[PDB]
Amino acid sequence: QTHIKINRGELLRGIEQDHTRQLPDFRPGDTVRVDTKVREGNRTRSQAFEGVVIAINGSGSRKSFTVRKISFGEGVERVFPFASPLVNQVTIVERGKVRRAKLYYLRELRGKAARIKSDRSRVMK
């Protein structure tokens, strides 16, 4: 039982943001020559900067944000929706006037690599 006549949601949206402190980046801009990079773990620390060379794309909804809309090619595909909400990662990058496909996720394509898949999305067929 937790329903009567009171609006308590400043924990669900207050205490929620009581811990935040960030203006992400928020650029869905695809195909960038360089970007953010996780702090890694492994040894004691040895906080390295070479997670994944993303194209940057996506958004999400609150403390979750399926960030990665990248994967690669040496390993077929391979996405792994990382957590936008974290205090252990490099503070992003942004570049590219971007010919934007659909933004956010896609799932399709992602196998139609070949060659002409640089930073565009229209095609004649």
Partner RNA sequence: CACGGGCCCCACUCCUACGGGAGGCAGCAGUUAGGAAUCUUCCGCAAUGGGCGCAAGCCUGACGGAGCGACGCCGCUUGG
Rounded-to-10 torsion of CA 91, 22, 79, 59? -130
Residues 52-81, one symbol each (x = binds RNA by CB under 7 A, - = not), give -x----------------------------
Smallest distance, Å, CB 105 to RNA? 24
Assigned token pair, 54: 């993303």
Helices (H), 16-96: none
* Distance, CA of 115 to CA of 112 (rounded, Å): 8
Residue 34 or 113: which CB sits closer to RNA?
34
Residue 29 vs residues 52, 96, 97, 117: alpha-carbon distances, Å: 16, 6, 7, 15
Q: Is 48 near RNA (CB under 7 A)? A: yes
Which of 2, 4, 18, 50 is the binder for RNA (CB under 7 A)?
50
Residue 49 or 104: which CB sits closer to RNA?
49
Assigned token pair, 9: 């949601």
Q: Which range in 6-14, 45-53, 56-64, 94-102 contacts RNA by CB under 7 A? A: 45-53
Residues forming contacts to RNA in the complex (CB under 7 A) are 34, 40, 42, 46, 48, 50, 53
